[PDB]
Design a protein around this ligand. Structure first.
Ligand code: ADP
Lengths: 54, 104, 120
């Protein structure tokens, strides 16, 4: 379908390598979001504790 | 800033100087919540946990955008004697939120 | 030949519609692969650029004479691409191209021209 030259093979290898970098970068983004999620869930516990006692 | 457990607690909220209500049934509470989203009490509502845990059906009913009326479960005056669910409530929060079940 | 005569010795404004220039090129690929003459890209014989040249280059206007030859070859891209040797060497002789897009045609748009890959 796409034009079969050696240049197009290099463009496809380049975008495969960019998507394989993107999997790593977005997993790292998910890791930072999970880090602040577990930083906030215990604040939710402490907020519910203070809310019920007051 | 409506809060719905009883009208008896809600006149205590008037004794705090904010508007509150009481319905003792689900559809009545969502209907008064619906007109409260329609004309605002500045869009910050808590409903009794034994009345409605998740009133978000009203959010997808009227105002799907901006999530401005924030809806909160709240421990009632006949229920705050026990300290409702806190740790298993966070268990089901994690189970609802991230998919996984954790212990931590 | 008839178009250069009618243009440049009787002062007409000839427009030459050269239909389906890929059937021409597969005909000369047939004789050029009869004679074992070594090919360029994708089987077409190596002297094909000069034959597309000595077709397409017989157009223009000449000084002092009021004739003119306006050529429109209706090319047919085989795989619907520009890298193929027939639309490619066509684009390297002539001055311009107009590319019809199948994507605009599926939405029911006649003339299905898209302007961004065409030039003049
Ligand atoms: N059976 C054939 N009949 C006619 N031409 C042929 C045949 N086989 C090969 N040829 C062509 O003849 C050419 C041979 O070149 P050559 O004999 O050196 O003469 P010239 O210098 O005139 O091309 C090749 O280019 C080849 O394509």
């Amino acid at each position: 379908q796409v034009s079969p030259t050696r240049m197009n093979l290099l463009q496809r290898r380049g975008q495969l390598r960019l998507a394989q970098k993107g999997v790593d970068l977005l997993k790292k983004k998910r890791d930072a979001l999970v880090a602040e999620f577990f930083g906030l869930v215990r604040e939710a516990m402490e907020a519910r504790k203070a809310l019920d006692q007051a | 800033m409506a809060v719905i457990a009883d009208p008896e607690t809600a006149q205590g909220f008037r004794l705090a100087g904010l508007e509150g209500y009481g319905a003792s049934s689900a559809e009545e509470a969502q209907s008064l919540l619906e007109t409260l989203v329609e004309r605002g009490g500045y869009a910050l509502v808590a409903v009794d946990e034994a009345l409605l845990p998740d009133p978000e059906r009203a959010v997808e009913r009227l105002m799907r955008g901006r999530d401005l009326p924030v809806l909160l479960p709240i421990a009632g005056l006949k229920e705050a004697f026990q300290g409702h669910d806190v740790e298993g409530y966070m268990r089901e929060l994690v189970r609802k939120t991230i998919g996984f079940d954790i212990k931590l | 030949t008839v178009a250069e005569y009618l243009a440049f010795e009787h002062d007409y404004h000839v427009l030459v519609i050269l239909t389906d220039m890929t059937n021409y090129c597969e005909a000369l690929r047939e004789i050029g692969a009869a004679r074992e003459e070594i090919p360029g890209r994708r089987g077409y014989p190596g002297y094909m650029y000069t034959d597309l040249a000595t077709i397409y280059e017989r157009a223009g206007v000449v000084e002092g004479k009021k004739g003119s030859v306006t050529q429109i070859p209706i090319l047919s891209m085989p795989d619907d691409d520009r890298t193929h040797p027939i639309p490619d060497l066509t684009g390297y002789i002539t001055e311009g191209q107009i590319q019809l897009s199948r994507e605009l045609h599926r939405k029911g748009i006649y003339p299905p021209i898209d302007p961004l890959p065409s030039l003049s």
